[PDB]
Structure formats: C-alpha cells, structure tokens
Design a binder for this molecule. Structure first.
Ligand SMILES: Nc1ncnc2c1ncn2[C@@H]1O[C@H](COP(=O)(O)OP(=O)(O)O)[C@@H](O)[C@H]1O
Ligand SMILES: Nc1ncnc2c1ncn2[C@@H]1O[C@H](COP(=O)(O)OP(=O)(O)O)[C@@H](O)[C@H]1O
Lengths: 396, 396
C-alpha cells in the first residue's frame, strides 16, 4: 500500500508537475488564427491537456531564458524558431550551445560518461538556475521543465553545437530510453529540441484530429507572439518559418482586440522604478477601454512566462480605480472601474516566486510596486477619461 | 554551473512545491477572529509565507483523508485535534495508526531498517495514493506533503500507535536528522504530528511577533472550521481543544458574512448527480446575496482542500446567470449577475486533477457538471429573485 515512486513514473501520473494529464476546460485559453493578413487572438472553447501545452512552454521559456542570458554578451541569441507539423514540435535558438563536456558529478552517479546536455535533458532537479540569484529574471529555476518535455515524448532529439563540436542524443519512450550521444566536429552553434508528444495518453487522437491540430497550432502561434513582445530587440521569433510580427505590447493589444473592438484607442505606458534591480526592468503596458468588453481582462508576459495572475495586475487595477473614483465623483468599486479594460503587461520582474511549477501565478509582496514603481500620469489620466466616459453613458 | 539538487535542498529553495518561501501578498487571505461568542471570518491584510500555511494544510489534509478512508470502516476517525501554541503546530487523529512495520523496499534502498512511518514522513514521492483510483476523493496523491512539513521544521515528532505498538520518531533540522524510532507496546491507536517551523528562514520573527501569532492562529482556526464542514458527521474538529462549531455550509456562510451582512438570508442547496461515482458525492451549497457585497466571492472546500478556483464555481455562476438574464429581461453579463453573491461550496468530487502541488485550482472538464449534476430549481429561483431585486434598485 505504501509505494515509492521515481520522478519518471510520478511525472507521468501527477498533475503537480505541469497540470492535468488529460483534457480539461482551461479558463481563458486563446490561440492565434489568421483572417486574411490580420492576426486575431481568439478563444478556444474546447478542452485541452494543460500538461501538453506546458511542455511546449518549458522549451520556449528555456529559449527566451538563453536570450536574456546572452543579450549583453558578445555571442547573442538572434533567433528562436518554433515549429509544429505532423504532431512534431521543435524549438531552435542560436547563440552559445549547451556545453559539450563530461559532467563529473553526473558521471560518478551513473558510473559512466554523462555529458552536460544529457544532465540538462534527463536529470531531474538539475540546471544552471538551481541557485537562482535574487535579481535573476529568467523563468528557469526548477531544473525540471526539459525533463517533463522528455517524459511526455514518445521520441525526442536534442541537438546542440558549441562552435567546436556537435552533440546529438535521442531520448525515447517517456525518458525510458536514453541513447548514447553522437559527437562530431562542427563550427555551427545552436540548440534544437525536437519531439513528438504522447498525444494518445494525454487524451488526443493519434494522429491529431483536424480541430486538435488547428487548436494546438493556434495556441503555440500565440505563445510565439507573446515571446516576441518579451524578447530583446535583436531577436526574431519564428513560428513555422514565418516571423511573429508582435514585437510590442501595442501589437499584442490590437491582436487581442481586433474582433471585439477594431479601430480603437491604445493607451500605452512604460512603468519604471528608480532603484536597482527594479530600475533595470521597465514594464511595457498597452490597454484598450471599450463598452463592449464584459469583464476586466489582462495578458501578462513576465520573465518570459505567460502567467494569468499576479500583484502586478492588481497594482494597475487599484491605481486606475483610485483616480476613476475621484474623477467620477467630481463629474456626477474596483470592479465597476475596471470591467471595460483589457490590458497587456510585458517585462521582467526580478526576485519573484510562483504558486507552482506551472507558473500560472507569480508570488510577490504588493508593496514592491507601491515602493518602487510609478505609473505615468498621462496614462492614468487617459485611462480615467475613457473609463469615466463609459460610466456616464450607462447612467445616461 | 550545471548543478544537481536533491529533494531536500530543492524543497527549501523552490516555490513550486508549496508556494513562495518568504512573505508575499496572498489574495483573499482570511482568518477566524472571536468577537464575543461570535466567530467572524475576516481578511488578513498582511503578507504571509504561502509555503508556511501549506505545511499546516498538508497535515490537516492528511488527517481529513484518513477520516474519509475510515468513514465506512469499523474503526473510524472520531476526532481531529489541531493545536498552535508557542509556535508549535500539532495535529492528532484517532482511528487506525500508520502501520508499525518494516518497509522492505525502503529498507533495501537505505541498507538498514526503515519502518513505514519513516517512509511516510521522510521519503519523497511516497505514500498510499501514488496510484490514485479514478474515483478517489482524498486530497493526497503526491506523497510529498508530509515531507515538506518536515523539511520546513527545525524539529518534528511523529507519533503513531496501531493498538499493539507505539512508534515515536524525531526528524530535525529540515529533515537532515532522522533519529531511529522508539517502539514500545501500547493499546492506544492514533497518529500525531508535532513540529516547530523554521519561521526565521520563512520571513517571520523568532519567536513570532504578536501580529504574526494572531494572524497564523486565525488562519489555522479557519482551516479547522473549513475542515469541520467537510468531514463526516461522526468526526469532531478541535482547534486548541475547542470544538470548531461549523459543521455545515450555513455555519460557514454566516461566519463569513457576519460583519458585512448580519441577519441575512441563506439560500441552500444539495447538488446531486444520478450516475456513480458522482452520485455518491453530493455538493452542499450556501449562498448570501447582498447589495453591500462588492464582487463575486466563493469559499470552496473540495476533497478536503481549500482551493480558490475551479469549474465547480463556474457551473453555479453560469447557471445562475442564465436565469437572472431571463427574469431580468421579462421584468424590465456573467459579472452583473453575480457580483452580489457570496457562496460556499463543500463536498467531494472524484477524479479531479490540479494545476500544482498546492492545489489552489482544481482541473476538470466543465461538461462533468452539465452532464452529471443538477442545481435544485428552488435554489436557482430563490437566488434569481434576490439578485433581480438588487438589479432593479440600482436602476431605480
Ligand atoms: N535552449 C537552451 N539553451 C541553453 N541552455 C539551455 C537551453 N535549454 C535548456 N538549457 C539548460 O538546461 C538546463 C536545464 O533545463 P530545465 O530542466 O528546463 O531547467 P530550468 O529550470 O533551469 O529551466 C537549464 O537550466 C539551462 O542551463
Ligand atoms: N494522519 C495520518 N493517518 C494515516 N495515514 C497517514 C496520515 N498522515 C499521513 N499518512 C500516510 O502517509 C502517506 C504519506 O503522506 P504524504 O506525503 O502527505 O502523501 P499523500 O500525497 O498521500 O498525502 C499518506 O499517503 C498516508 O498513507
């Protein structure tokens, strides 16, 4: 009755690692769909497997982490190329590869030669963020993300090149089969992850049905677009070799409001702080205010992660509400004030935590914002004007 | 740069296991405070450490799981006794103890004698729920909760008795020191966990400040009260030897609305399903509708867990909204409809998953509810009456 699991078997069975391991209703699930030349972010009203979307997310975030790590180095990440076709998922970045070197600790443990990329891909609780600096703005921390991808893959190929050498390793059958790597001379420099998920075990058809394929493609496309607003100005994001043309919070904002409120006004702000480390990390905001928005809604990309809850949002909500209360009273709750707002927040916040491995919710003291950050008054004033206009109509 | 962690060190560093490992703002944090003979559930507007509250929760849920496991057995759980004093936390339940027996697998691994309760308390990814039945309604699943308690304890004592024997083991210094157990003859039968958290490392004063102590006590008290509404009718919950007098969703409802809306009307429902396993697990609901409630709010206790998000809520929201739309239109969005509702939902739901180890959000297909459950019409009608009254006032 009292059983002992290993990581591998536990990760295949337990929702704690990446969420539900079958299809469920995911609140606010969205994808990108192409209408003509327009990108449109649209709700996907079908159940999907959270753990499946997470494995994609884990590799995408590994790539955006490498971009942040290299942005102030000589050798940079210039591209992240994400592909999805015939059920196969791939993510490729340039910049320095994963070190092609024996890992001593790992080699002693396994009583054989294990190289760093094998530890990166097959060893649980392992990576370069195990001792994360209080100021680190990478999403990486747990040393788990890539191994979960592997464990939810029927086959996987890791390829990395360090400018001197190339390293190819096959990991198959949910991490049960770790093939010895193939190492050859090379002057290329990149890292590619390629895999086929265990769709059947995760509640999908094999191969994917038409709707499953279209939903997943739309979802991944939108994550790529979110990634492209986050990443530094020297990096291009591709989805199936097409550049993602959403390098700004404005572009995201329009894409999410194209159907609901086209030809609308976009309030913008860069939210800054005076003290390091916060002062290194401005937050870009775009917001739309429309009477045909039903409730408050936000899209957050923080430290490369598409989280759905955090005090960063609350900070904007309350600040806006305070002003909207005043200006309304003069002219004539936190929900009344904000139910017509759709807002996009993109940037880095150092020293945050999370509520789980999935990073759906960031964890922080509200007072970080009160103490350190100010929202430009022009943005507050603009938003208050538009909100109050709408409040004066319904009354009238 | 590429480090390998063990569970122990990882759990002390990483928010994925139990949430933030320092004080942060916790949305909707509440405690129970005594005003005269009245219990009052009140907001705690100070930052607290989520991981700290979780370790309490993990042991409390282990006890409520044992109550569910034994409720249809001959030897039952008749009490759960929760204590908090001088910083020391304890939880004691009767009913069958944890087996006082050598664990063979664990003994081979450690190359010595390890008994089951040591595996229960010190071995990660281990327990009786590793292979959880599709119909299991226990919160337990990960085989991690008790080990996290231990890892966040400067000292801990596990005591269990199986009617023939008693077993006492000390686990100290964040699970670094596992003392050999003391086994003696006994005819008692129970399990007690007693521990002192590492408050300093989690961002509290040592000892606790006045406000820290009062906040934590209020929080634990309220979790005990939540536990008492959940547990079977043969079980009494105690907090510091005082019975928690909240054995019904009505009592919870009043306790949460005593300050905001005393002497108010409580709409009640038992939500049932025709098909097993759902039909075994009725959901008890109490709701209050008041104009001086600012937004929609719920309190959920599901499978013994105080989760803050799930489709169970959404099911009630939408069903209520549909009716409120109709009845309003006749007389003359999902937010308008529901912003005056405060609702309590308590019961078991089989075969759910979660978004993380913390179990803040349950994961399920919305269609489970549409397919299997019906909300009694009298309750829907009552709620619609009260909601529409309030909608006709603001207009007027
Ligand atoms: N695309 C990549 N480029 C460079 N290094 C990578 C890449 N993907 C993964 N890594 C390395 O592999 C380690 C293990 O990855 P993962 O298990 O996802 O852990 P983490 O929590 O650090 O993201 C990372 O910490 C990083 O050092
Ligand atoms: N109070 C208790 N009474 C009986 N058994 C218990 C109790 N607390 C813990 N256990 C046992 O110890 C195991 C390990 O506990 P834990 O690590 O919390 O795992 P789980 O995820 O199963 O709750 C449980 O699965 C259960 O079998």
């Amino acid at each position: 009755a009292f059983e002992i699991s290993d990581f591998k078997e536990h990760a295949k069975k337990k929702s704690m690692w990446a969420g539900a391991l079958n299809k469920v209703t995911i609140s606010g699930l969205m994808g990108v769909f192409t209408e003509d030349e327009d990108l449109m972010a649209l709700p996907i009203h079908r159940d999907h497997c959270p753990a499946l979307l997470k494995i994609f997310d884990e590799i995408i975030v590994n790539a955006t982490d490498h971009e942040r790590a290299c942005h102030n180095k000589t050798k940079k990440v210039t591209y992240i190329k994400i592909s999805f076709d015939k059920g196969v998922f791939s993510c490729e970045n340039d910049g320095p590869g994963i070190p092609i070197a024996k890992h001593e600790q790992a080699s002693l443990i396994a009583k054989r030669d294990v190289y760093v990329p094998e530890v990166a891909s097959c060893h649980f609780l392992a990576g370069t963020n195990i001792n994360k600096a209080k100021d680190c703005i990478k999403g990486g921390t747990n040393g788990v993300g890539l191994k979960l991808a592997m464990v939810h893959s029927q086959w996987a190929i890791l390829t990395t090149a360090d400018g001197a050498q190339k390293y190819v390793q096959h990991i198959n059958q949910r991490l049960d089969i770790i093939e010895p790597p193939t190492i050859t001379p090379s002057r290329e420099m990149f890292t590619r992850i390629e895999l086929m998920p265990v769709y059947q075990e995760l509640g999908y058809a094999e191969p994917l049905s038409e709707t499953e394929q279209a939903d997943l493609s739309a979802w991944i496309y939108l994550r790529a677009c979110q990634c492209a607003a986050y990443v530094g100005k020297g990096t291009t994001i591709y989805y199936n070799d097409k550049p993602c043309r959403t390098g700004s919070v404005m572009a995201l904002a329009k894409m999410y409001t194209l159907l609901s409120a086209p030809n609308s006004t976009i309030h913008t702000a860069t939210i800054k702080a005076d003290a390091k480390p916060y002062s290194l990390h401005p937050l870009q905001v775009a917001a739309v205010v429309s009477p045909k928005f039903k409730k408050f809604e936000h899209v957050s990309v923080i430290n490369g992660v598409n989280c759905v809850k955090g005090e960063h949002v609350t900070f904007l909500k309350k600040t806006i509400n305070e002003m909207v209360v005043k200006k309304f009273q003069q002219t004539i709750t936190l929900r009344d004030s904000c139910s017509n707002i759709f807002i996009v927040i993109v940037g880095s916040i150092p020293g945050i935590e999370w509520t789980g491995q999935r990073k759906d919710e960031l964890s922080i003291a509200e007072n970080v914002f009160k103490t350190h950050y100010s929202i430009p008054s022009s943005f507050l004033t603009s938003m208050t004007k538009s909100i109050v206009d709408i409040l004066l109509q319904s009354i009238s």
